[PDB]
Amino acid sequence: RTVARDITLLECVGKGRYGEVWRGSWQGENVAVKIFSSRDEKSWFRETELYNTVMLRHENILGFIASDMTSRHSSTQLWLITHYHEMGSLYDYLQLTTLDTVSCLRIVLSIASGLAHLHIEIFGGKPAIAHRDLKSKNILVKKNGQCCIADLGLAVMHRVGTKRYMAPEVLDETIQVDCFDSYKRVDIWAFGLVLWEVARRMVSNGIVEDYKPPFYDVVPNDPSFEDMRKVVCVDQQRPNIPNRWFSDPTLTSLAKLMKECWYQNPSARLTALRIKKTLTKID
Ligand SMILES: COc1cc(-c2cncc(-c3ccc(C4CCN(C)CC4)cc3)c2C)cc(OC)c1OC
Numbered sequence: 001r002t003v004a005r006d007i008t009l010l011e012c013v014g015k016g017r018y019g020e021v022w023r024g025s026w027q028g029e030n031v032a033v034k035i036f037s038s039r040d041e042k043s044w045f046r047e048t049e050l051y052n053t054v055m056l057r058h059e060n061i062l063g064f065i066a067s068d069m070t071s072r073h074s075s076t077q078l079w080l081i082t083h084y085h086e087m088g089s090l091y092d093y094l095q096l097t098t099l100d101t102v103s104c105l106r107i108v109l110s111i112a113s114g115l116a117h118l119h120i121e122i123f124g125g126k127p128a129i130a131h132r133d134l135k136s137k138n139i140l141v142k143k144n145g146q147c148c149i150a151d152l153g154l155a156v157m158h159r160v161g162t163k164r165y166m167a168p169e170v171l172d173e174t175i176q177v178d179c180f181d182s183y184k185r186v187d188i189w190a191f192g193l194v195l196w197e198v199a200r201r202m203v204s205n206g207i208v209e210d211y212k213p214p215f216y217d218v219v220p221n222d223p224s225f226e227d228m229r230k231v232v233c234v235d236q237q238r239p240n241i242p243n244r245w246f247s248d249p250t251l252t253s254l255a256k257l258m259k260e261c262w263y264q265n266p267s268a269r270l271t272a273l274r275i276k277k278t279l280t281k282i283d
Pocket residue numbers: 002003004005006026065066067068081
């Protein structure tokens with residue numbers, strides 16, 4: 001039988017230190033192709049090792065298609081091929097769009113759903129998985145208004161995370177590194193920051209906040225580890241809740257939820273399953 005492997009690379013939709021992401025075509029269908037820099041080969045290996053362990057399949061997890069290693073004269077080429085989401089990342093989307101109540105809730109509940117699927121062990125099934133780099137650039141927007149979580153290159157099963165989104169116990173190095181629940185609680189902190197980024201873009205009473213990343217007002221671009229530690233650990237700052245949120249029942253409820261993702265004590269934070277339940281009772 002014929003095995004048609006050729007993928008046509010059509011346009012670059014992302015370039016970074018990690019490498020590049022391309023819109024590609026396979027048998028008439030869009031795929032996304034991540035081409036890894038040699039500097040970040042371990043991210044390809046870890047994501048491949050995870051998918052070789054458990055073939056994750058969930059509407060709110062970026063859909064795996066293939067992992068390819070190709071021999072070159074002087075190098076190894078590493079590609080990850082996934083489903084293609086033409087609307088791009090949540091980070092991108094929130095810059096050019098405001099949200100109504102239904103669309104805000106649908107976004108955040110879909111992220112909570114993907115995250116709970118990663119976190120929870122299924123027996124007989126899947127190991128529990130922590131993401132370790134959850135942020136709005138690692139979430140894609142689907143045409144049906146739900147999102148999916150991308151990039152399992154740091155994931156752990158039961159490179160460091162983006163500093164802006166690191167929990168206090170990562171910044172002060174008190175994290176219990178031998179305890180898998182520690183890693184879930186780091187993801188919950190980051191989830192709360194994403195919930196804040198999204199909630200800002202939800203209109204109420206004709207008001208909306210401009211898109212800003214978490215801590216935009218207290219750290220520089222590309223904040224250092226020390227910049228983040230001083231804000232999050234020493235001063236114990238948290239993102240601002242605008243007064244206008246307290247005129248809107250949805251944003252009032254979301255503010256409470258994000259507060260319960262940001263406790264200094266990791267074991268006080270809500271679980272992904274509890275976040276899902278709370279979001280199903282909002283509106
Ligand atoms: C090697 O490389 C790539 C391969 C493919 C690809 C292309 N056609 C057909 C296939 C195929 C799938 C599954 C079976 C099964 C059939 C049932 N039987 C009991 C076991 C075997 C056979 C063939 C594949 C996997 C795509 C690629 O890119 C999208 C590849 O490159 C990464």
